[PDB]
Amino acid sequence: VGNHTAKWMQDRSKKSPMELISEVPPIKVDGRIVACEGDTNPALGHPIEFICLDLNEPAICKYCGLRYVQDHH
Amino acid sequence: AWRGSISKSMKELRILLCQSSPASAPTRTFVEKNYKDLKSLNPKLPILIRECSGVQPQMWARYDMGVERCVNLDGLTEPQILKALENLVKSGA
Amino acid sequence: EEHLSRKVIIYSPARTATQSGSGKLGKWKINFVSTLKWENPLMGWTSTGDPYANVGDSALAFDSEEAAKSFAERHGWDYKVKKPNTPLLKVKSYSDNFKWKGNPQ
Amino acid sequence: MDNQFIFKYSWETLPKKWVKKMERSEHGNRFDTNTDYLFQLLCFLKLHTYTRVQVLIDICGVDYPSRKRRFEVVYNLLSTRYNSRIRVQTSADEVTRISSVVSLFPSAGWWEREVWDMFGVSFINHPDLRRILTDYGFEGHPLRKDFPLSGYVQVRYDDPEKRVVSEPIEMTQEFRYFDFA
Amino acid sequence: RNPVGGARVHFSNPEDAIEVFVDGYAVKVPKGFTVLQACEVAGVDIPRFCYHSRLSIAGNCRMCLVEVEKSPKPVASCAMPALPGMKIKTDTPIAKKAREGVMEFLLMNHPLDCPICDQGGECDLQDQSMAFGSDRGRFTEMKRSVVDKNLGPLVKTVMTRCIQCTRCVRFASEVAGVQDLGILGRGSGEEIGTYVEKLMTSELSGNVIDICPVGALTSKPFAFKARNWELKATETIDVSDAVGSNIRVDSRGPEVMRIIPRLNEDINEEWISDKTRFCYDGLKRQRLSDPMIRDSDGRFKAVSWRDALAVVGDIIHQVKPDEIVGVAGQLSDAESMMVLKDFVNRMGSDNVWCEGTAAGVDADLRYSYLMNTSISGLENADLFLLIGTQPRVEAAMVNARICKTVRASNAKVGYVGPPAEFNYDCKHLGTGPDTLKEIAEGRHPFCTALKNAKNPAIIVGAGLFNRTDKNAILSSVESIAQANNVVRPDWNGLNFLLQYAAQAAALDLGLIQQSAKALESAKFVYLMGADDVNVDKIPKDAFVVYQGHHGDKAVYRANVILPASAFTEKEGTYENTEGFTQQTVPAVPTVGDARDDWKIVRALSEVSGVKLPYNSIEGVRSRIKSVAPNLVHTDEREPAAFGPSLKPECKEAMSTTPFQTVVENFYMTNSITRASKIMAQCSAVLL
Amino acid sequence: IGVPPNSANLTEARRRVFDFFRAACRSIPTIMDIYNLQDVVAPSQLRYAISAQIRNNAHITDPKVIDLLIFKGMEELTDIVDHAKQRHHIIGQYVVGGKTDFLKNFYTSNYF
Numbered sequence A: 001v002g003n004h005t006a007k008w009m010q011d012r013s014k015k016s017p018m019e020l021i022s023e024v025p026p027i028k029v030d031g032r033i034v035a036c037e038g039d040t041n042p043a044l045g046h047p048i049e050f051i052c053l054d055l056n057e058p059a060i061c062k063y064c065g066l067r068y069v070q071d072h073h
Numbered sequence B: 001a002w003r004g005s006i007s008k009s010m011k012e013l014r015i016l017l018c019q020s021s022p023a024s025a026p027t028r029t030f031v032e033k034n035y036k037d038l039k040s041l042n043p044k045l046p047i048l049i050r051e052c053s054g055v056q057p058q059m060w061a062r063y064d065m066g067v068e069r070c071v072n073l074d075g076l077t078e079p080q081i082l083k084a085l086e087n088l089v090k091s092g093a
Numbered sequence C: 001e002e003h004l005s006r007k008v009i010i011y012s013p014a015r016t017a018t019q020s021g022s023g024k025l026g027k028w029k030i031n032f033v034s035t036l037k038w039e040n041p042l043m044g045w046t047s048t049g050d051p052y053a054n055v056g057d058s059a060l061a062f063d064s065e066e067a068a069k070s071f072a073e074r075h076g077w078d079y080k081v082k083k084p085n086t087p088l089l090k091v092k093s094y095s096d097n098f099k100w101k102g103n104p105q
Numbered sequence D: 001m002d003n004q005f006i007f008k009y010s011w012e013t014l015p016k017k018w019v020k021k022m023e024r025s026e027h028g029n030r031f032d033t034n035t036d037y038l039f040q041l042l043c044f045l046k047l048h049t050y051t052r053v054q055v056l057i058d059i060c061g062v063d064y065p066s067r068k069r070r071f072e073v074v075y076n077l078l079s080t081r082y083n084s085r086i087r088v089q090t091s092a093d094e095v096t097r098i099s100s101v102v103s104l105f106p107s108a109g110w111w112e113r114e115v116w117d118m119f120g121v122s123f124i125n126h127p128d129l130r131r132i133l134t135d136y137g138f139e140g141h142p143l144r145k146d147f148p149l150s151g152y153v154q155v156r157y158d159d160p161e162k163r164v165v166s167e168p169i170e171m172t173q174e175f176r177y178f179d180f181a
Numbered sequence E: 001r002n003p004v005g006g007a008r009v010h011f012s013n014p015e016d017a018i019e020v021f022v023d024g025y026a027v028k029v030p031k032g033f034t035v036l037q038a039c040e041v042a043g044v045d046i047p048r049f050c051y052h053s054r055l056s057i058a059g060n061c062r063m064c065l066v067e068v069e070k071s072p073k074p075v076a077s078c079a080m081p082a083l084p085g086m087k088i089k090t091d092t093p094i095a096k097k098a099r100e101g102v103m104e105f106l107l108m109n110h111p112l113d114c115p116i117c118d119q120g121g122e123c124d125l126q127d128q129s130m131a132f133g134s135d136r137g138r139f140t141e142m143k144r145s146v147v148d149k150n151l152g153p154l155v156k157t158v159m160t161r162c163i164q165c166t167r168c169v170r171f172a173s174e175v176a177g178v179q180d181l182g183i184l185g186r187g188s189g190e191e192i193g194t195y196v197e198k199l200m201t202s203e204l205s206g207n208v209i210d211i212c213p214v215g216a217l218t219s220k221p222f223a224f225k226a227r228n229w230e231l232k233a234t235e236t237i238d239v240s241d242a243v244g245s246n247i248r249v250d251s252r253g254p255e256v257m258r259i260i261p262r263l264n265e266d267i268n269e270e271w272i273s274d275k276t277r278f279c280y281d282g283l284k285r286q287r288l289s290d291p292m293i294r295d296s297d298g299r300f301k302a303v304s305w306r307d308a309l310a311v312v313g314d315i316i317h318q319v320k321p322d323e324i325v326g327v328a329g330q331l332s333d334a335e336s337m338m339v340l341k342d343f344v345n346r347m348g349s350d351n352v353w354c355e356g357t358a359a360g361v362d363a364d365l366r367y368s369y370l371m372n373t374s375i376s377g378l379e380n381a382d383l384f385l386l387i388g389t390q391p392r393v394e395a396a397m398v399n400a401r402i403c404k405t406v407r408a409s410n411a412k413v414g415y416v417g418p419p420a421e422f423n424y425d426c427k428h429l430g431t432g433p434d435t436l437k438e439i440a441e442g443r444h445p446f447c448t449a450l451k452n453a454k455n456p457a458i459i460v461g462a463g464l465f466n467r468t469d470k471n472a473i474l475s476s477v478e479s480i481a482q483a484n485n486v487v488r489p490d491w492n493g494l495n496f497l498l499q500y501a502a503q504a505a506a507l508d509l510g511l512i513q514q515s516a517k518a519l520e521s522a523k524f525v526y527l528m529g530a531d532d533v534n535v536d537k538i539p540k541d542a543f544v545v546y547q548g549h550h551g552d553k554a555v556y557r558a559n560v561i562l563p564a565s566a567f568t569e570k571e572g573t574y575e576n577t578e579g580f581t582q583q584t585v586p587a588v589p590t591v592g593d594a595r596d597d598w599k600i601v602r603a604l605s606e607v608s609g610v611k612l613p614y615n616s617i618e619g620v621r622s623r624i625k626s627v628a629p630n631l632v633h634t635d636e637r638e639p640a641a642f643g644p645s646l647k648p649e650c651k652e653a654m655s656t657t658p659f660q661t662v663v664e665n666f667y668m669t670n671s672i673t674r675a676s677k678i679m680a681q682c683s684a685v686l687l
Numbered sequence F: 001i002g003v004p005p006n007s008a009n010l011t012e013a014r015r016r017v018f019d020f021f022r023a024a025c026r027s028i029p030t031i032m033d034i035y036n037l038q039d040v041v042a043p044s045q046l047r048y049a050i051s052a053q054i055r056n057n058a059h060i061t062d063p064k065v066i067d068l069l070i071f072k073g074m075e076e077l078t079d080i081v082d083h084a085k086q087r088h089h090i091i092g093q094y095v096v097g098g099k100t101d102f103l104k105n106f107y108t109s110n111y112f
């Protein structure tokens, strides 16, 4: 719906990828760090990304947009 | 009394000279010796002293309607640079 | 004929500011100042009609100022030379990080 | 007949004024010669019993814009008799004609036409020296470094004239030069 | 052997030179040079991350290790001083293995995000990994991760990529003069940051993007927009101020993508200001693209060039000659200013001047409106006296030079003018001309400090040039300079700081306002890019013609709009504060139906019936040779030929009005900057 | 038939120029027939264009440059005759059949 998506997406029947990724709830992790590969099979995903969870705001994987939060604190 | 009437005759006077060349030495002496009195007698006349590393000693006067005249100062002595100024002030002005 | 009368600039591209390495210097280029491009009104692609659009940065190169000047003067182009800026090496000491401030004033 | 024997024997036997530079390398034995001795050197190599360089594999030009003689003409040759290859090179500029070797190697005819078409080097005593690859009436020599990749003109059908015609080029999307250096 | 990058080596005396060997080779270096510098003189490029020639040596990255004979350990070449007879080896197995190990340690915790990192394609880490350590990774444990920090709208942060080289911290402390960045914590967990939430407010903050060797600090407005290999590089100059900072303009097609500094030891030393770096957005916004005449309903309508020029030419012959006024904009090049002056003088008017405070100054002597010390010459000054100027917001690179001189040589700074925030210690001496009288009369600790200074430097701002008591202020300043021997054959410490890129060339060409109230009595006003003139002083019935590439208020008042080229789209001559003349280089095509300014003026002159004796820019420059020949002798340094002695004595009284502030908003100074998102956001948050 | 050696001096080069000019002029009727120019342009204008091309290069003093120009002229003549590409007002490279220039160029565009 934003200006970025309107540059290429000319169909409003489906949600844009930005809205779709935002609807995925943050994944809870036991710990202060998590590694994201974007796929259950790492060779079929994206280069491994290690994400720090020290901040209260959910941390976003810069490759696939998955979000992670510390489960306890 | 012509030196006190330069403003009435021309809109702008330009003196181009070399900073270090011997050919520009009479022009530099003329500037150093006459600019004080010329500007005091003509407080509202722009007297543009423009020095350049390799220009021949020149002197320009700008009148009405943008008409200009130039005098080549090469091979001239300090008093003859003053005559040329008087000629520019008194004729064609 | 028509393209042999254009004005060009002979220069040595300086080092980029995003990298500390110096391995792309010493080359001399002929800038053809090709600055006539527009947008194709079908896909937004960048169109041009100037034959020397990229030859000065992709193919034509010269190892020295004199070679580029000779080539330009043989082809008859009007050229202006821009001397490259070079760094001045200055005496630097790691001891300077711990200079005595002197007696208090 | 290995490249050590060719280098040594050619040093011993060739007239000295023919060769300015001799390189021995796994990349190939290489002889550089002035343009006025190219023909005689090639005739010697072809006819001499200990060389028998009978096959002219090709002739090609290389453009070096930083050089006073910008063109380098390379002759790749083969001896089936001795199972050996030789490279002979000479330099040239935009106006100096060099000798044709068609009378030595008939295969040279078209390779010389190609050098003339692509680079603009002319060949003395060539029986039929005209362009061979480019379109008729082509202007310029495309393999020169200063010749633009897309050239200067393009063609299209023109209905009012009922024919294909040539106009100055107009590029919908210009060639993008990616400088990774 | 040629030095690396063609670097110049200056010897104070040949006796003060030592001899060292770099890989067998004999090289001669000055005493005090480091091993790395001796390698550069030898032409050997030593890899480095933490070392920067303009910043203090750190010696922490350990990538510059080399082998020195009789040394037990590998030697950090960036920090080790060179000694006579030293035998330096850079390609021995010890050095190669040390480089491989250090590179392996660097990549150990480095994130695998080259495809999303903007440094990709111009990354020192990538190149040195390809070259020195072509070792197959063997680290299989978990990498450390770091949260991103908020530093403002200019610097985008990805701290996982940071290699703790501390270049940004040292730049903040030593060059920017704003200590906001530090290194927090200890060990592998140390993090670069400000600890507390705060944005980088220094006007030189953007250079940390250049100095950061990895993609940890990147340009936020440029984020993700392009790769370095698809950008065309044009070497040109900046027109944001009167400094003339050397820049490289990167473009893709007919669009400027980014602006990065260009090395020039005499002007800006590979640094630029944030205004210079991030003003490129406005080049594609609110562009005047077509000629326009206001219609019957008082609305602009697009026309051809011939119709607009015919209208202007027809209406310019219906006014008195003294009623024609032409004003040149702050971004005008010398050629267009010369053509405008010729056109207006040939219609019988002398009301041609450049917009700004220095509109009607005495331009007879070139020393009186230029920085005679030169920017590089400031580093030799031991004392600074600033009179009515805020160099931090008026000339950012000059202020950077002053700060560097203060930090290095412990020079003192006295300031007279309104209160302002300096990035270096400085005594406030007063606020107005009473302070000048006190300085002239002596009896003050700063007066004896000025007398006890070997090479004092007075810097007078051009903002004082529009005051009513301008002659009195200038006379007092020159008397202070004479009493302290500021101007000597071996030292010219008298300086005047201009504010506009066009001001120096305009003063050289004689674009001087004679009548102080000529704008209030004009019926034909030609505003050649002069968007900063106050247009309510123009009579309501005057015919106003605006020529430029942007505009807010003058465009509203203008009866005719003539679209003009921008500085990135043309080749124009500009002179900076120190009298150095430079030329722009075209980087991108113009937009719409725009034309070069001098072309528009010449075309109008032809339409108006005046025949100028030139039809090309070469003819314009030949004409300029008859007025200001220094303007066509580009890229040349020349000393002053005449000084204060020729000035007539002045007896005007001294007013009591304090000095005012010239630049109220650093980011809003010209029409280009006022049309940029990024500059507006900087004004919103960074001020 | 074969490509001759370079002219030794300006005299023999001038002789080659005269030979080329004669060959070019003698081919004018063939060109008029091939391009159907009877009602478009006179044969003398073709002769005049060829001679003007020869005259515009009258300042050349190097025989090798003259030989190259003659060779190129022969090739262009051969392509014009043997492999004609008919346009209308144009044969090969020649067009067949109160304000100064600055104002016209300014009205045209910003690139002169």
Ligand code: SF4
Pocket (backbone or CB within 6 Å): E110, E111, E112, E113, E114, E117, E118, E119, E120, E121, E123, E124, E125, E126, E161, E213, E214, E215, E216
């Ligand atoms: S800084 Fe960026 S480009 Fe360089 S190695 Fe790291 S991720 Fe790759």
Ligand code: SF4
Pocket (backbone or CB within 6 Å): E161, E162, E163, E164, E165, E166, E167, E168, E169, E192, E211, E212, E213, E214, E216, E217
């Ligand atoms: S952010 Fe960049 S410049 Fe600062 S310490 Fe990290 S790698 Fe070095």
Ligand code: FES
Pocket (backbone or CB within 6 Å): E047, E048, E049, E050, E051, E058, E059, E060, E061, E062, E063, E064, E065, E076, E077, E078, E079
């Ligand atoms: S460059 Fe010397 S240790 Fe970093």
Ligand SMILES: [Zn+2]
Pocket (backbone or CB within 6 Å): A036, A037, A038, A046, A049, A061, A062, A063, A064, A065, A066
């Ligand atoms: Zn992911």
